[PDB]
């Protein structure tokens, strides 16, 4: 009868004395080792004193699991562990000082997201995500990638979108201070100012150009006509500007990083462009550099702190 530890968070460990003549499943319910489902398996001898993840089956474990993951979804742990079983076999090469991912299991959108997350200021609310984000920044990204899959409700090999992935992660981040003030000018209706907070204050869909957003973009007015929307005030450490992919020129020093998407809707591949002392293009493990870039861009990230318009 070996001594093991059970946990939902790998911080609070609970000593258990297990029966060597019963499965982990019979004694604990769903039980995992480093991602590997061992519910239907007897305790070996080299399992002695090791840490097992369990599905929460008492109040203490349910509270610990919510405090760590910020979800009570009973499927979360099994989806996280199933993802981790693959993400632990991925390769996380250091490319131009950034942790990337070698191509596997349609993971280009995760590699692009992971590269982006290393270049923008973001604090995650769930300790599971914040802890794994620090570990990923230091080169140990397998756990973080499995969490991103579980929080986005995506499995390994499923096709993914960087913008949708960033949106889910931002909904799990402290963006409460982020504020965006917009003005809409219609010939007829006149001027209406609106204030957005959190995720809606940092994401925009319809133009890649932060400068064009400051000048004004044409949107339909509920009245019928076309109106100009422009940015009045921005308080955030970054903005994400997205549009359906189109040929776009990226200028060294005018943006932080960008998502390149080649191919048809739900049938293409991401590469990541980052502005350093020159432009670096990261394609999983592969790196190329050039002074200029023109290609199909769908996301551009920019630095911000505080912007106020000069438009009266
Ligand atoms: C949306 C999506 C999902 N859900 C999953 C995987 C890929 C994409 C996608 O095509 N995204 C790209 C960036 C994209 C997003 C939006 C519009 C697009 C139009 C033409 C071609 C690609 C477009
Ligand atoms: Cl625990
Ligand atoms: Cl929450
Ligand atoms: Cl891929
Ligand atoms: Cl959260
Ligand atoms: Zn939360
Ligand atoms: Zn795999
Ligand atoms: Zn109008
Ligand atoms: Zn791909």
From Swiss-Prot:
The active site is at residues 108, 269, 283. It is found in: Host endoplasmic reticulum membrane. Inhibited in vitro by GRL-0617. Zn(2+) 4 binds at residues 186, 189, 221, 223. Changing residue 142 to D: In strain: Alpha/B.1.1.7. Signal peptide: none annotated. It is a multi-pass membrane protein. It comes from the Viruses. A zinc finger (C4-type) spans 186-223. Changing residue 265 to G/T: Reduced inhibition by GRL-0617. It catalyses: Thiol-dependent hydrolysis of ester, thioester, amide, peptide and isopeptide bonds formed by the C-terminal Gly of ubiquitin (a 76-residue protein attached to proteins as an intracellular targeting signal). Residues 1-54 form the Ubiquitin-like domain. Residues 68-312 form the Peptidase C16 domain. Responsible for the cleavages located at the N-terminus of the replicase polyprotein. Participates together with nsp4 in the assembly of virally-induced cytoplasmic double-membrane vesicles necessary for viral replication. Antagonizes innate immune induction of type I interferon by blocking the phosphorylation, dimerization and subsequent nuclear translocation of host IRF3. Also prevents host NF-kappa-B signaling. In addition, PL-PRO possesses a deubiquitinating/deISGylating activity and processes both 'Lys-48'- and 'Lys-63'-linked polyubiquitin chains from cellular substrates. May form homohexamers. Interacts with N protein. This is Papain-like protease nsp3. The chain holds residues 1567 to 1878 of 4405 of the full protein.
């Amino acid at each position: 009868t070996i001594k093991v530890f059970t946990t939902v968070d790998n911080i609070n460990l609970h000593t258990q004395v297990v029966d060597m003549s019963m499965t982990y499943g019979q004694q604990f319910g769903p039980t995992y080792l480093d991602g590997a489902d061992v519910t239907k398996i007897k305790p070996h001898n080299s399992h002695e004193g090791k840490t097992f993840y369990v599905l929460p089956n008492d109040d203490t474990l349910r509270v610990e699991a919510f405090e760590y993951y910020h979800t009570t979804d009973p499927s979360f742990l099994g989806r996280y562990m199933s993802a981790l079983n693959h993400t632990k076999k991925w390769k996380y090469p250091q490319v131009n000082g950034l942790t990337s991912i070698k191509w596997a299991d349609n993971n280009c959108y995760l590699a692009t997201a992971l590269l982006t997350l290393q270049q923008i200021e973001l604090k995650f609310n769930p300790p599971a995500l914040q802890d794994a984000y620090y570990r990923a920044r230091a080169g140990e990204a397998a756990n973080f990638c499995a969490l991103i899959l579980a929080y986005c409700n995506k499995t390994v090999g499923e096709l993914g979108d960087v913008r949708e992935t960033m949106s889910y992660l931002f909904q799990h981040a402290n963006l409460d201070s982020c504020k965006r003030v917009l003005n809409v000018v219609c010939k007829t209706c006149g001027q209406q100012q609106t204030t957005l907070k959190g995720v809606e204050a940092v994401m925009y869909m319809g133009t890649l150009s932060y400068e064009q957003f400051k000048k004004g973009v044409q949107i339909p007015c509920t009245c019928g006509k076309q109106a100009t929307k422009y940015l009045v005030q921005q308080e955030s450490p970054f903005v994400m500007m997205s549009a359906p992919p189109a040929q776009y020129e990226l200028k060294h020093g005018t943006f932080t990083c960008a998502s390149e998407y080649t191919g048809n809707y739900q049938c293409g591949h991401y590469k990541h462009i980052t502005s350093k002392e020159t432009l670096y293009c990261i394609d999983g493990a592969l790196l190329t550099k050039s002074s200029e870039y023109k290609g199909p861009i769908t996301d551009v990230f920019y630095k911000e702190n505080s912007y106020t318009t000069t438009i009266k």
